[PDB]
Design a protein around this nucleic acid. Structure first.
Lengths: 196, 92
RNA sequence: UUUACUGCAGCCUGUCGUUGGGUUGUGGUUCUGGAUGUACAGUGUAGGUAGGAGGCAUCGAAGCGGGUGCGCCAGCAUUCGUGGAGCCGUCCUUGGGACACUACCCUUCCGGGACUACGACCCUAACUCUGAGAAGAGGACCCCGAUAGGUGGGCAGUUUG
RNA sequence: CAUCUCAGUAGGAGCGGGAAAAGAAAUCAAUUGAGAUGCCGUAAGUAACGGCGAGUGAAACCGGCACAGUUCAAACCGAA
């Protein structure tokens, strides 16, 4: 075989708790816990994951690590009249996934960029960590790049907030075609949010 | 009241009068894989469960004596509309 | 309002994740030294059920010490030794099983070595509190996420013909 | 009246353009076929759900409008 080192990074991260990544995870969550919500990083933790998701080593491509709490939609008990069905909220998790929460927090932190994609990079009993790739549509490098210059279009702005990333489409139910996508494509709002 | 354990009567299957043994019918356990059980498990969530939170009702003063008549020849059983008695026994 | 109905918060508690490293106590995981197997007597221990018979030996076959496997201080393997012939059975010790050194997986044997679920204790290194910090105190507990049961007019919606 | 309905409605928060979203099958079919997406008609108050009560409620096929296909990650080269 002649495999790339991206393949080895993939194998190492296939079962991370059974590889050296578990120990690295042990030292590394110590540093990550001390960090805040949204941290810029020089290089992706999983280079092969970043490159397959669209990361390139060029000007205007930023990579960030976002920390998100665990569990479901931390929800308030209603204080007025409700049905019994609508009174309970503890078991009500949201419809917004943790990955998309992290993507949207990164987008909020970086107003001038657009979220491309994100990937899981760690988690503990309280937090999950994601790495979000962002693109600068106003950088000349990105403008020249013909595989990324679609992001300079007026419709590519607000991708993470409008659900246009891969995680957003998965949460919208458009990851598949055919049966089960009757109330999801072309949009959740198009069918009165009855899908999902 | 007493009914004989065995007596000669009509078998609907072999279409003759043969000896038949009477057996009291015991109510079986409800399957957990029935459609109503699956619907109950599907409608269990937060809040009232609808008809699946109903408490079972009361009882009549007397229940019917559920009996089953097995032909001694073809070994097939049929069950007929049954009487209603406080005290039931088999004559032997 | 409540020991009306049905729920929901809060709280109590089991389990999973967070969550690591040691010491022992508990189950078999897995296998070395023996196939250790024996109503009746045995020349002889069914050398597992077996080609219902057929191979070894002073270059090894025994009557002995607390008898190294075992056991009825018998007897098979020749070992620490010294004593100077255990055959297979068509004389089957009139058979619970009747027996050739022939790839022993099998009720034992206790190196149980190695992973495992529960429980007890210890360590710090995660994690938590204090401090500006050195550091101090706790510590895989607690908090927290999820799930399971309880308690629950604290709160909600109703009913009370 | 509690599941249900009202209804993912009302209302809220975020993003955002002249349109937006979707979009080139890990699809739909059924014995063998079709061939991106969207929208309209139909399927049809059908299948399905439901104190199987009240009610809620598709899609595919098919007929149309308009039609459009492609770019990365990797393999090979190695700053070209």
């Amino acid at each position: 075989m002649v495999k790339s080192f991206y393949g080895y990074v993939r194998d190492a991260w296939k079962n991370p708790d059974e590889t050296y990544v578990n120990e690295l995870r042990w030292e590394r969550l110590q540093v990550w816990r001390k960090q805040g919500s949204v941290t810029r990083i020089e290089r992706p933790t999983r280079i092969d994951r970043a490159r397959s998701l669209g990361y390139k080593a060029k000007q205007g491509i930023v990579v960030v690590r976002v920390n998100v709490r665990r569990g479901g939609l931390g929800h308030v008990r209603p204080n007025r009249g409700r049905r019994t069905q609508k009174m309970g909220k503890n078991k009500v998790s949201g419809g917004m996934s943790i990955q998309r929460i992290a993507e949207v927090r990164a987008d909020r932190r970086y107003p001038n960029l657009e979220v491309l994609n994100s990937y899981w990079v760690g988690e503990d009993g309280k937090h999950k960590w994601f790495e979000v790739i962002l693109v600068d549509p106003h950088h000349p490098v990105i403008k020249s790049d013909k595989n990324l210059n679609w992001v300079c279009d007026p419709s590519s702005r607000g991708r993470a907030t409008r659900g246009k990333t891969s995680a957003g489409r998965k949460g919208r139910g458009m990851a598949t075609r055919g049966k089960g996508t009757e109330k999801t494509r072309p949009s959740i709002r198009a069918y009165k949010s009855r899908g999902k | 009241m007493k009914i004989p354990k065995r007596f000669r009567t009509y078998c609907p299957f072999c279409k003759t009068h043969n000896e038949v043994v009477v057996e009291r019918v015991k109510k079986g356990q409800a399957s957990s894989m029935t459609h109503i059980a699956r619907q109950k498990k599907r409608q269990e969530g937060i809040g009232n469960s609808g008809k699946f939170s109903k408490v079972p009702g009361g009882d009549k003063p007397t229940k019917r004596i559920w009996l089953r008549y097995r032909c001694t020849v073809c070994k097939k059983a049929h069950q007929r509309p049954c009487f209603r008695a406080k005290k039931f026994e088999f004559k032997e």
